[PDB]
Amino acid sequence: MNILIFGPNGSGKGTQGNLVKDKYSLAHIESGGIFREHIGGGTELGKKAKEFIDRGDLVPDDITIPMVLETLESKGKDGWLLDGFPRNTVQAQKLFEALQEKGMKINFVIEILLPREVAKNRIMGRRICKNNPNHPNNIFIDAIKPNGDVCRVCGGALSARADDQDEGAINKRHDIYYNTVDGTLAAAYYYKNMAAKEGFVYIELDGEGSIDSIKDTLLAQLA
Amino acid sequence: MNILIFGPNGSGKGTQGNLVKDKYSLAHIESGGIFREHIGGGTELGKKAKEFIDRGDLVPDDITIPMVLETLESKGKDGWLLDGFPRNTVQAQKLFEALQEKGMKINFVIEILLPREVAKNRIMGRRICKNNPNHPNNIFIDAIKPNGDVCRVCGGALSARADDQDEGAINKRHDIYYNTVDGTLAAAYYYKNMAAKEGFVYIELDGEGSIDSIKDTLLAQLA
Amino acid sequence: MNILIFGPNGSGKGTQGNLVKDKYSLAHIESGGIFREHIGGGTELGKKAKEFIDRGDLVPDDITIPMVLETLESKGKDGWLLDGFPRNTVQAQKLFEALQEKGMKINFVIEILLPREVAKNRIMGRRICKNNPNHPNNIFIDAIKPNGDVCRVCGGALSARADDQDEGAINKRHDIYYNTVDGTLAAAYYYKNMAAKEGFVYIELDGEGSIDSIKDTLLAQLA
């Protein structure tokens, strides 16, 4: 079972992917870990990639796509969940052609749907408990609203994290994710639009339902 | 059902208390919220307390204990869980005499047990995920160890929180908690030692078992 | 030369004290360091203090005042600057009587004056540069306003610190500082009111002028 997952920052995408990967014993493959395996491990592709990174340039798609496929072959032989790549349409189509050339089949593509204003507010609304950072509090998510100014689980003090309040940075990542010309939504839709012809199932998850409700609908449509 | 809960920082005490209060529909009463009700709301006891606080002195026990009892009467009429008070033996005995004078019965006292070195390491070992602060990671808790330097749920970057690394502050709170002469353990033991005579049950939870395992044993011994 | 300095959080008090202590080769004695010398070093007074702290009670004034005087005798024999003690009128008068009993003379008392709303806004207005935390930026201090959303020195990204945004905590410290019944301003005024009789000079610094301008007027009135 091979799955691609898409969703913006603010959509709970890591949480949902973790649940799927545990249930189906999948390798969870994330674009950052691919580079550490190849750039850090000095594979022939990684030594080639690292000459771009070390000038401040990006790695070209003709090196990145073979890296991804090498990792999928190596870590994903009993099934994989690919998270965070592709980000744009050129990458999505190069990835699809590379997977076909190696006979590697996509079985599911999952997209978590959330309006961009909702996604941004969910990130900025997070409040961290001083006593235990695991305690979920979010001023913009009714089911886990704080108890006034304090933690709804234990009554500890709450604070905001500066990176969650950095609106210029949140907006530049959502700019790319929500770009339906050639950004990540256009990439997700390129897969949606060929699912029926290519024999895979495209699953749309409504990101506004609860952690439990989303997990139920998802684990039902893969089962 | 009236319950007192004790445990050091690093023992998961808020999490466990929240579970108990939800299961039994208890008011969760924490020492900080008592002051906001009385100091903030200008009760006669609160206006009296606030003259000490405003000089930098502590509120005397002859004002704090009546505050606690007024809150228990007011917010806790259908059952309460009192968390974070008493902290020492003088408070514990004044509280017991005040509860007897008002005919308010203790039904359970819960103590979460953890060695102090274990408690400190659990606090300092916490690592927060950049992508989602809910994702539990802890270098000192094997079941939720990170995946190398990254989040074990989603592969996001991890960082430490400065307050979790502040060893002088952690040690001064554990100094008080673990003081068996007249600190919080001596207070917990004052209750343990009269449980049989006073007709309440003293529950000891081994804080090194999992969130699930502790919750099972606890919810079993209250049931 | 012996000096007491008073000022609220938000008044630049540490900066000014450091300048005075360097110019006059004074020991800078701060209430926190007194405890580490005595509580940490197990002086007879410190072992006595630590039994209160370890129950969660404050150290009584009849132990704290002798501690302060022992430190002044020991670290301050060639002149001292005492910062952060006394905080209330009872401490201020006990300190004055203890200094007289040991023949230790006050030469100057410095008070940095700022309206409380100004002090709070100066704390909340601080913005820290990502590239270098030394670069001063403050949305509420015109001379060091940021350059739009970025550092006015180097153009780096700016963020806020959670403790600078914690209005409940800022307000509880200003509650004590600005309490003119028996809090820290009442303590400062107790000294002001006896300066002429006791042969010391009381210096009032207008905390709204620049770091340079305040330093000039101050170093002039001590010279």
Place this chain on the structure above:
Amino acid sequence: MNILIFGPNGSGKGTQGNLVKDKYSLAHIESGGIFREHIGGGTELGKKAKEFIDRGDLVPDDITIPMVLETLESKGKDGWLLDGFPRNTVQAQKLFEALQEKGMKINFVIEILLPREVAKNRIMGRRICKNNPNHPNNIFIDAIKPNGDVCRVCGGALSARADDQDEGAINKRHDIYYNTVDGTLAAAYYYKNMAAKEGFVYIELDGEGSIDSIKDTLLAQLA
């Protein structure tokens, strides 16, 4: 007077540039602000750049170099200090040819020199004072070492910032800066090597001397 400045993270580069720009009334032009002027202001080059950024690709040098020159013409007509661009040799040579085509002369190039291990330790050694974040403390810089665990200016508590402790991120920026094949040092040296032929002066600042000492030698060699 037109100046290019180079230095790694950890070298005090913003501080020194600010001093030069104030003394000579220069526009301080930093690579981040160029994009906000063009990408944010929708110049014809900026609308072109933003189509790459919105796919997650970099802006090509044939768009970035004209952007830089347009900003230099517009904001830098009475003299500029260009900070943070170029980062590699291809950019450095394209920039030089673009400046020649517009008749814009370089007068000085400043390089702040520090060994990479020294630069990393200066970043990781920073400690921020709780009372005032302006107070410089650094465990790796002897002149501003803390006073034990506390602020050397005011005795306040010290903490570390997570981004200053992120060694993978520090190393990836130093990887590019210290790359003498085609990274930022190779770019700086491309200018050094033509200074005499092109009639500009290349200034090397020893980054291990004090803020004052560096500023003196620098302001002397520009004067």
